[PDB]
mmCIF file of C-alpha atoms and ligand atoms in Angstrom:
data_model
loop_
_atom_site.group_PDB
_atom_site.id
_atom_site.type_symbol
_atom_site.label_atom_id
_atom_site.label_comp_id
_atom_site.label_asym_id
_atom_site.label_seq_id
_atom_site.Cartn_x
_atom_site.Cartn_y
_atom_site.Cartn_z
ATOM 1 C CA UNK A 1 80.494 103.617 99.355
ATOM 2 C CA UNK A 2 82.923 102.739 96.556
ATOM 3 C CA UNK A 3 79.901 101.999 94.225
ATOM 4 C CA UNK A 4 78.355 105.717 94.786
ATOM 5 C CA UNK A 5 81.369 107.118 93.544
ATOM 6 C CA UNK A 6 81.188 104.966 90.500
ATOM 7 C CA UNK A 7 77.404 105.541 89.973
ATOM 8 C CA UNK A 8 77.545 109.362 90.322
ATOM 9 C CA UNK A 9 81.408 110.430 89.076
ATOM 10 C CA UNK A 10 82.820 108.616 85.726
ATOM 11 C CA UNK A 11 85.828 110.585 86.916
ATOM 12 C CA UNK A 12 86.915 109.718 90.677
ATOM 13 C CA UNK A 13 89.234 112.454 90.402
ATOM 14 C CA UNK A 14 88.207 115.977 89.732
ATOM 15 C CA UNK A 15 90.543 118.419 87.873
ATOM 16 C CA UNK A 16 91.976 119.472 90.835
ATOM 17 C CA UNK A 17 93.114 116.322 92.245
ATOM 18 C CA UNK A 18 90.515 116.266 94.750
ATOM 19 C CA UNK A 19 88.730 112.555 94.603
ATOM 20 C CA UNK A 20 85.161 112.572 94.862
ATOM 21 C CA UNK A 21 84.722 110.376 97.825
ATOM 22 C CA UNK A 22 85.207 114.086 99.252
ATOM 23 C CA UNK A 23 81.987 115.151 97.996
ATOM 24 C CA UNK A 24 80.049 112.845 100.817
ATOM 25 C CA UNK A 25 82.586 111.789 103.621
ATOM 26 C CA UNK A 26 83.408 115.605 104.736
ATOM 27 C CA UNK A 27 86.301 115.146 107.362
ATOM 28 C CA UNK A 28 89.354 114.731 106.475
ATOM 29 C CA UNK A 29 91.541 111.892 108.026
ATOM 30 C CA UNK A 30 94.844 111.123 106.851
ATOM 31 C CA UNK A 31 95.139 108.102 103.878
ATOM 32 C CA UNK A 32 98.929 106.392 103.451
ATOM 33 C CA UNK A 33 100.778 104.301 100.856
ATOM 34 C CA UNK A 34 103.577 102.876 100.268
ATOM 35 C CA UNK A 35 104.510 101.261 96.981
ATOM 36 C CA UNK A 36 108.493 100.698 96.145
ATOM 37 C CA UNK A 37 110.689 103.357 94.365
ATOM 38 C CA UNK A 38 110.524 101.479 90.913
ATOM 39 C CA UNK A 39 109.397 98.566 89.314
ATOM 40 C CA UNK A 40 110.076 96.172 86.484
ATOM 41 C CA UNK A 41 107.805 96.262 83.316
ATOM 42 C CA UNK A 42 105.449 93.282 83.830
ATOM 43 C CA UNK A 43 106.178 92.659 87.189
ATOM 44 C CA UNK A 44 104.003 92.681 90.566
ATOM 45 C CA UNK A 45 104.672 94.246 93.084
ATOM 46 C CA UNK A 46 103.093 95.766 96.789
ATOM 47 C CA UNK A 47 101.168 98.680 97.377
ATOM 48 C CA UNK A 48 100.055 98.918 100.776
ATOM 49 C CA UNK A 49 97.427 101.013 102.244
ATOM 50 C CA UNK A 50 96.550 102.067 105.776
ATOM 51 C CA UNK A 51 93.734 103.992 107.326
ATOM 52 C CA UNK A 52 94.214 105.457 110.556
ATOM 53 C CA UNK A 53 91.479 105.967 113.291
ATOM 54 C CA UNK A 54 91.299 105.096 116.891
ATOM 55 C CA UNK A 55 90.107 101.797 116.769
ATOM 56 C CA UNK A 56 88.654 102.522 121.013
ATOM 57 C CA UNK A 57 86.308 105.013 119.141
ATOM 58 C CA UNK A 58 82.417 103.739 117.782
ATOM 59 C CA UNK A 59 80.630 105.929 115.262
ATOM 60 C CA UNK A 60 76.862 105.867 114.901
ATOM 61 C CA UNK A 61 75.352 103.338 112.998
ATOM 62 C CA UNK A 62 72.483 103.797 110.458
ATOM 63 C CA UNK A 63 70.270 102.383 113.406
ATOM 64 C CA UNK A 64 71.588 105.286 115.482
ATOM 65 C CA UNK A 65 73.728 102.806 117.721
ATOM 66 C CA UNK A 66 76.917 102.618 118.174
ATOM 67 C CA UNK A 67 79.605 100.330 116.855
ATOM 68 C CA UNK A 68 82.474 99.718 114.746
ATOM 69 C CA UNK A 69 83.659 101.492 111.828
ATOM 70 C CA UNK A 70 84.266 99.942 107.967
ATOM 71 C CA UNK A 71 86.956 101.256 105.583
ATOM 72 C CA UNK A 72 87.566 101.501 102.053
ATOM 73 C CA UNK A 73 89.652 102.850 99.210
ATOM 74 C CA UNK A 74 90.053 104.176 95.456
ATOM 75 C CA UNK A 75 93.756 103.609 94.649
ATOM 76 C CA UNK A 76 94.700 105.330 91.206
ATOM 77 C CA UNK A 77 97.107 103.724 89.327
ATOM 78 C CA UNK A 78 98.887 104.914 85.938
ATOM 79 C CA UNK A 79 98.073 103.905 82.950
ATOM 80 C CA UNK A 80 98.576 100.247 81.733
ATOM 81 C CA UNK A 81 98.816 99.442 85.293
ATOM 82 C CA UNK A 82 95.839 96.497 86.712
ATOM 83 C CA UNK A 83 95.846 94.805 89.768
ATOM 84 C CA UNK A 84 97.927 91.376 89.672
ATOM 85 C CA UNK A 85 95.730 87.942 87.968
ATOM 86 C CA UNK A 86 96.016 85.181 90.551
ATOM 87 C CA UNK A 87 98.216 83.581 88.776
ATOM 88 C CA UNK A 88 100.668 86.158 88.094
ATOM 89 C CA UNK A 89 100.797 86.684 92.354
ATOM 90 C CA UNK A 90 104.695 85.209 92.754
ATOM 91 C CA UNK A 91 104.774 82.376 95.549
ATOM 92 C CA UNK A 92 106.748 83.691 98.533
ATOM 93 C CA UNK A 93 103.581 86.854 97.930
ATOM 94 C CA UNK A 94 100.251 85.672 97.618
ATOM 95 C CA UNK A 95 99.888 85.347 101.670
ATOM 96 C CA UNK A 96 101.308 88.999 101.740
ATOM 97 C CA UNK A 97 98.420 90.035 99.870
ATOM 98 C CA UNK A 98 94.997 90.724 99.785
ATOM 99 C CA UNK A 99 92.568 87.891 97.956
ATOM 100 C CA UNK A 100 91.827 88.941 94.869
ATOM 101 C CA UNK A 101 87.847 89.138 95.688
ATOM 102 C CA UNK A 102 88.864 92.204 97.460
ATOM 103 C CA UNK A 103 89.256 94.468 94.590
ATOM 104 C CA UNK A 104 87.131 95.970 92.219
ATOM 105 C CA UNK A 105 87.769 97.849 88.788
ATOM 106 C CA UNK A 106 86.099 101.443 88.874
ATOM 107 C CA UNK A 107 84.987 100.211 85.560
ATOM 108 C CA UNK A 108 85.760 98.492 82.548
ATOM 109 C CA UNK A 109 87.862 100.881 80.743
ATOM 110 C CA UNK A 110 89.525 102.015 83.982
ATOM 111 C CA UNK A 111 90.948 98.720 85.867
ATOM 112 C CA UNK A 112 94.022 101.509 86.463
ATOM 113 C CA UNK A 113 91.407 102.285 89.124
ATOM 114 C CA UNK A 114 90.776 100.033 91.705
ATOM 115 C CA UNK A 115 87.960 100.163 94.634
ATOM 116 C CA UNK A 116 88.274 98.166 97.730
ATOM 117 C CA UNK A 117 85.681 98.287 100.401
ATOM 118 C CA UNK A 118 83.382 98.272 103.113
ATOM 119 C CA UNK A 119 85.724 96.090 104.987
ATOM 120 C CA UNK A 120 85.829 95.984 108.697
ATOM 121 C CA UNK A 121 88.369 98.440 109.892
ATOM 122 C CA UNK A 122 89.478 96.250 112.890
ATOM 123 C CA UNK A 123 90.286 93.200 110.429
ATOM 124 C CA UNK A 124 92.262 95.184 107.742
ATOM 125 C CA UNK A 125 94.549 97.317 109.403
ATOM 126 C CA UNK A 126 96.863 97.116 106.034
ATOM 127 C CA UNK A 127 95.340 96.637 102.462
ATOM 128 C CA UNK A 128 97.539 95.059 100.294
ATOM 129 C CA UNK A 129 97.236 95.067 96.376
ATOM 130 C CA UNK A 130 99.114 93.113 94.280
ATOM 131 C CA UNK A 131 99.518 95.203 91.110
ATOM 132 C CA UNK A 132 100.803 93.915 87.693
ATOM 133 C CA UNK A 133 102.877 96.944 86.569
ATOM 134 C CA UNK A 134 102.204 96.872 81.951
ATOM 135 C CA UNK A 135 105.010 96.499 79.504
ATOM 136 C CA UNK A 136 105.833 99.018 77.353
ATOM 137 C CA UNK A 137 107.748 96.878 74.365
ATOM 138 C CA UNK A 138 104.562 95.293 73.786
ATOM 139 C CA UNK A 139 101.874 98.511 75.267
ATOM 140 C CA UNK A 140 102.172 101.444 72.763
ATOM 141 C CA UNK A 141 99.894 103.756 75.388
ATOM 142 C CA UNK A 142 102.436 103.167 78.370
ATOM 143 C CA UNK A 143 106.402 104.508 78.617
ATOM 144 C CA UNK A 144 109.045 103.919 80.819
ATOM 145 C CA UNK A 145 109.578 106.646 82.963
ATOM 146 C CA UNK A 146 108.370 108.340 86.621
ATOM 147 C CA UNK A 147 104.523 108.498 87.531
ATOM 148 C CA UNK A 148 102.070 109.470 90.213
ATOM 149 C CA UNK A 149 99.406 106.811 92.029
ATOM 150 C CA UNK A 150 96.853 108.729 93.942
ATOM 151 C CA UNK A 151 95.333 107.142 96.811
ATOM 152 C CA UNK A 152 91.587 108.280 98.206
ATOM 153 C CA UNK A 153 90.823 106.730 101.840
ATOM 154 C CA UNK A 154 88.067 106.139 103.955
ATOM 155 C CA UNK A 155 86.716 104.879 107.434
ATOM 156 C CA UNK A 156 83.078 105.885 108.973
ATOM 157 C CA UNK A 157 79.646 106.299 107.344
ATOM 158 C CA UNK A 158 79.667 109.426 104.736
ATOM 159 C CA UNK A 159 77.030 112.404 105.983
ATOM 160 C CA UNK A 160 75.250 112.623 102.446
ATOM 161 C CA UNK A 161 73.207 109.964 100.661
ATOM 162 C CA UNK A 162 73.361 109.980 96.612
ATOM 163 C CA UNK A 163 70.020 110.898 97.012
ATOM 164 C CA UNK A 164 71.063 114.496 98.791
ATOM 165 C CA UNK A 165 70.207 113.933 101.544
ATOM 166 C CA UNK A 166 72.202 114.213 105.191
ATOM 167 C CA UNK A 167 72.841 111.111 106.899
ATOM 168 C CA UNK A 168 72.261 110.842 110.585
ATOM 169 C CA UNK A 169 76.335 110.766 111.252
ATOM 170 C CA UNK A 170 76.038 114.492 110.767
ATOM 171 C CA UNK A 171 75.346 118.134 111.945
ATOM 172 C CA UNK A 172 71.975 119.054 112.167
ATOM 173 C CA UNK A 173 71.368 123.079 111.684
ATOM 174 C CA UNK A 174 68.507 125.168 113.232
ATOM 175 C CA UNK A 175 66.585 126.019 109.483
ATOM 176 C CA UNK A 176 65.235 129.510 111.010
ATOM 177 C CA UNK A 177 66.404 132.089 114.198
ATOM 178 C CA UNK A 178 64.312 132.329 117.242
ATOM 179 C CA UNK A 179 63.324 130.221 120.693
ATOM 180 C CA UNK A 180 63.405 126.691 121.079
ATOM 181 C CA UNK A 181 60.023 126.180 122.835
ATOM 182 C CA UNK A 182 60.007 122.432 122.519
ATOM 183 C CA UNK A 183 61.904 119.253 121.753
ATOM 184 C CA UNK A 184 60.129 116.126 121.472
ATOM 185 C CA UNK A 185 62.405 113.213 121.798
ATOM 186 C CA UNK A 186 61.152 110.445 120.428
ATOM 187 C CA UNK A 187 62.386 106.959 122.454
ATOM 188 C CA UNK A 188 62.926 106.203 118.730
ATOM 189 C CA UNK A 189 66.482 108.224 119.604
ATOM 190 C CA UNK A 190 64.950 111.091 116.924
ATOM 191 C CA UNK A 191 63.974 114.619 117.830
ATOM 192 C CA UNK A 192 61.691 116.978 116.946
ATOM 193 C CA UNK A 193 63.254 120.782 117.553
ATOM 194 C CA UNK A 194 60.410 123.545 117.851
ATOM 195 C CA UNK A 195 61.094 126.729 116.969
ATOM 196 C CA UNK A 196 59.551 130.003 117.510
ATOM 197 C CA UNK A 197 60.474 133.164 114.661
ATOM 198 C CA UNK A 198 60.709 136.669 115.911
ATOM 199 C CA UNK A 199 57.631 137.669 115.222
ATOM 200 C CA UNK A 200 54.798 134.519 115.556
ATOM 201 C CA UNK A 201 55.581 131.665 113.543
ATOM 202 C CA UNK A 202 56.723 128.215 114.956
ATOM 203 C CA UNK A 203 59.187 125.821 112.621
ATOM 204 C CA UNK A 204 59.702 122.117 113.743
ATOM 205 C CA UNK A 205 63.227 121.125 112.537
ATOM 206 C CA UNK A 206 63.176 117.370 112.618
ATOM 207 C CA UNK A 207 66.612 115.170 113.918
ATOM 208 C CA UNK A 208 67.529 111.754 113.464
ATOM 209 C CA UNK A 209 68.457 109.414 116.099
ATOM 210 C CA UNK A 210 72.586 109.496 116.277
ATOM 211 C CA UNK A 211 73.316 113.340 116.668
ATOM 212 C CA UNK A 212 73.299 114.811 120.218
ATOM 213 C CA UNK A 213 71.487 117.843 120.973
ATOM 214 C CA UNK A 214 73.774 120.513 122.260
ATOM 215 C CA UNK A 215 70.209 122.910 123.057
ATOM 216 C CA UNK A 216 67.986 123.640 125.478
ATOM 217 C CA UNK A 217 64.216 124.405 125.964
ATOM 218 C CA UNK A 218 64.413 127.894 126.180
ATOM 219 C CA UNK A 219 67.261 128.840 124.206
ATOM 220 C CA UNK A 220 67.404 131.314 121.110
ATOM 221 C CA UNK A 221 69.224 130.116 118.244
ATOM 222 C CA UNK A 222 70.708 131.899 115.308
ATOM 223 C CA UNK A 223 69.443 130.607 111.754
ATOM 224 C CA UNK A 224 72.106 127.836 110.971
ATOM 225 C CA UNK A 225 73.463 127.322 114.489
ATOM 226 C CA UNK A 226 74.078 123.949 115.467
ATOM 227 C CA UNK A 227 71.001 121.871 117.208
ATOM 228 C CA UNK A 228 73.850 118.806 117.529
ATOM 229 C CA UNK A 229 77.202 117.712 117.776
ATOM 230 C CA UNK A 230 79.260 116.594 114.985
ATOM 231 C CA UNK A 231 78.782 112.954 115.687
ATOM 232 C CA UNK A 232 81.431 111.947 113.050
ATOM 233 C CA UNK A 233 83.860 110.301 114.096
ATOM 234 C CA UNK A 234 85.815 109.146 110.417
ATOM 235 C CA UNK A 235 86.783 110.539 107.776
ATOM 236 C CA UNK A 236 88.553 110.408 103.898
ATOM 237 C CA UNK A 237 91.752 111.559 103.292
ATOM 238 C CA UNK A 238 93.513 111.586 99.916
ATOM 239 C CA UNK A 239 97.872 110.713 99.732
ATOM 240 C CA UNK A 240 100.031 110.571 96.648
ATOM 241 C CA UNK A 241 103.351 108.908 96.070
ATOM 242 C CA UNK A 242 105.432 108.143 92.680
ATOM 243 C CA UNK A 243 106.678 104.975 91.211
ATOM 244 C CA UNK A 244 109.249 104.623 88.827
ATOM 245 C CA UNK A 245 108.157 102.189 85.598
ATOM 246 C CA UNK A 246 111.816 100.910 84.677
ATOM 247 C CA UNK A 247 113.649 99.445 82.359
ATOM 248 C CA UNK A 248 115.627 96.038 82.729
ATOM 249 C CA UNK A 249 118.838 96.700 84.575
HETATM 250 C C1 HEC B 301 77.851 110.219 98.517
HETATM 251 C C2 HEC B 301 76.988 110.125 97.213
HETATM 252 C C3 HEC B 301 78.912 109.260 98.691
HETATM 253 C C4 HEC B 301 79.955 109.030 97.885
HETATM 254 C C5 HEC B 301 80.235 109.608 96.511
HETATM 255 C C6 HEC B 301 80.786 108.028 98.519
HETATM 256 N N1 HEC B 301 80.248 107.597 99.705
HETATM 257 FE FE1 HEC B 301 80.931 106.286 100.976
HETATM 258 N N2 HEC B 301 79.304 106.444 102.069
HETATM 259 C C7 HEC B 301 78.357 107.461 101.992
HETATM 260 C C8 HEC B 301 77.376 107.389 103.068
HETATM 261 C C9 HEC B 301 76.201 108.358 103.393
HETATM 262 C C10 HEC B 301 77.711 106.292 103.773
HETATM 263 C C11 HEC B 301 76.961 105.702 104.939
HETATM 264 C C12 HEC B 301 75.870 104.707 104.546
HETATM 265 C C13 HEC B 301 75.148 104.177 105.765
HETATM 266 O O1 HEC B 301 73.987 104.600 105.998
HETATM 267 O O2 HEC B 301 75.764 103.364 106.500
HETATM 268 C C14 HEC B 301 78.900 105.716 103.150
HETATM 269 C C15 HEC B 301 79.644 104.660 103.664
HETATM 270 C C16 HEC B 301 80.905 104.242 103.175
HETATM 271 C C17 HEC B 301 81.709 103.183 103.787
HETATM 272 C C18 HEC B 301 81.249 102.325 104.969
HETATM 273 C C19 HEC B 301 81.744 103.078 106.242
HETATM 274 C C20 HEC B 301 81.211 102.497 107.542
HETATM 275 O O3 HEC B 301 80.121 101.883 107.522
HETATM 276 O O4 HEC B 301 81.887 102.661 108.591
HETATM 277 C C21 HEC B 301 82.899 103.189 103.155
HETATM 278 C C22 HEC B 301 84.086 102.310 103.471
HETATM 279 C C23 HEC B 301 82.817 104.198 102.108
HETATM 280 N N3 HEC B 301 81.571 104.828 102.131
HETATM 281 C C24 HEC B 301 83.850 104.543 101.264
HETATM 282 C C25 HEC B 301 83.761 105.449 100.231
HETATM 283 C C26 HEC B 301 84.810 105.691 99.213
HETATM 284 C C27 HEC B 301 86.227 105.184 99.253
HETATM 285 C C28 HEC B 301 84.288 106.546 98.274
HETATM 286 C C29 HEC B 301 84.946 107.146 97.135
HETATM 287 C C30 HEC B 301 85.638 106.175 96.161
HETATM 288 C C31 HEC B 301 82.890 106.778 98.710
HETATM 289 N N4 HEC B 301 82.575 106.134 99.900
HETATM 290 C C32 HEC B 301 81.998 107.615 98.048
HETATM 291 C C33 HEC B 301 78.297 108.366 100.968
HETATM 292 C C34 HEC B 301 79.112 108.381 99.840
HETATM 293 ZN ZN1 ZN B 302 93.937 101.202 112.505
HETATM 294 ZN ZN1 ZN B 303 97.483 111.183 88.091
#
C-alpha cells in the first residue's frame, strides 16, 4: 500500500528513478499518463492515470480466495506543484475529476507527491487529479521552464509485507534439494511440503493457501526450485512524461 511506501522510504524515488513501490509489488505492468503539453502558472489542469489489467482475471485474496483486484498510485509532480483546493477546481471540471478525498500528500513537506489508493480497479478505470500548477512571480523555488512528472502504478496485492515477509500472492521455493515424500494439504487451502536431503534429513517447507503446487509426491527437487506457481496476477509499473510550466502568452 501507498502508506508502506511512506512508512519505510522518505524518498519514493530512488536515485535511479526506480520508485519504491518496486521493492514489494515485483511484476511489472505497464502505468500511463497523460497531462497536457504546458500549462499556465497558477492554473489547474488534468493529469490522468490508467492502470491496465484484464479486468476477466481474479488474483488471490489474503484469505486465499479469489476476487477482484484494487489499484493505486504515487504521481510525482515538480516542485511547487500540489494537487488543485476544491475551490480552485474550475466549473465545467470538477465532475471530470476525482473528489478530492481521493488524494493523499506523501507527506507534509512533499504535497508535490501525491498517493492515491486502494481503490477498486473495476470502478476507477481513469484517475483523474486536478493539479494546481505554482507561480513563479510570487514562488522564488519554482521557474518557468520544461519538467518531468513521474508516475509509479499499481493493481494486485504486493508479495512482501513491511515486515519481510512473502505474501501468499507469491512463489514459494523448495528451502533444501532432495525428495518430496509428503505434502499435507491442509483443507485450510495451506500446505505442508516434506522434504527428504541426500543423505537422511527431512525439511518441511510450509505454503500458504493461494499458491498452487506444481509438485508431486515423489519428485526430487533442486534447492530453490519452485513448489508453486506464480499466482500473481498484477503488477507496478513506473511511466514518465514532461510538462511545460509557461509563461502568459
Ligand atoms: C512492501 C513493504 C510494500 C510497499 C513498499 C508497497 N506495497 Fe502495496 N502492497 C504490499 C502488499 C504485500 C500488499 C498486499 C496486502 C494484502 O495482504 O492484501 C499490498 C497491496 C497494495 C494495494 C492493494 C492491491 C489489491 O488489494 O489488489 C495497492 C493498490 C498497493 N499496494 C499499492 C502500492 C503503491 C502504489 C506503492 C508505492 C507508492 C506500494 N503499494 C508500496 C506491499 C507493499
Ligand atoms: Zn482496466
Ligand atoms: Zn524528477
Amino acid at each position: 500500500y501507498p502508506f508502506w511506501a511512506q512508512q519505510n522510504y522518505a524518498n519514493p524515488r530512488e536515485a535511479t528513478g526506480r520508485i519504491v513501490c518496486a521493492n514489494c509489488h515485483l511484476a511489472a505492468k505497464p502505468a500511463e499518463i497523460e497531462v497536457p503539453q504546458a500549462v499556465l502558472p497558477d492554473s489547474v489542469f488534468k493529469a490522468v492515470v490508467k492502470i491496465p489489467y484484464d479486468h476477466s482475471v481474479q488474483q488471490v485474496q489474503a484469505d486465499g480466495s479469489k476476487g477482484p483486484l484494487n489499484v493505486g498510485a504515487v504521481l510525482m509532480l515538480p516542485e511547487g506543484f500540489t494537487i488543485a483546493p476544491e475551490d480552485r477546481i474550475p466549473e465545467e471540471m470538477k465532475e471530470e475529476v476525482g473528489p478530492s478525498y481521493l488524494f493523499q500528500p506523501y507527506a507534509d513537506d512533499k504535497q508535490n507527491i501525491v498517493l492515491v489508493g486502494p481503490l477498486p480497479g473495476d470502478e476507477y478505470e481513469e484517475i483523474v487529479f486536478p493539479v494546481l500548477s505554482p507561480n513563479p512571480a510570487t514562488n522564488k523555488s519554482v521557474a518557468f521552464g520544461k519538467y518531468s512528472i513521474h508516475l509509479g502504478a499499481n493493481r494486485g496485492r504486493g508479495q512482501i509485507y513491511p515486515t519481510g515477509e512473502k505474501s501468499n500472492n507469491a512463489v514459494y521455493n523448495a528451502s533444501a534439494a532432495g525428495v518430496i515424500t509428503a505434502i499435507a494439504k491442509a483443507d485450510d487451502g495451506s500446505a505442508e511440503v516434506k522434504i527428504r536431503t541426500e543423505d537422511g534429513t527431512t525439511i518441511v517447507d510450509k505454503i500458504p493457501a493461494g499458491p498452487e503446487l506444481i509438485v508431486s509426491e515423489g519428485e526430487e527437487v533442486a534447492a530453490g526450485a519452485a513448489l508453486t506457481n506464480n499466482p500473481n496476477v498484477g503488477g507496478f509499473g513506473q511511466k514518465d512524461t514532461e510538462i511545460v510550466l509557461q509563461s502568459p502568452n
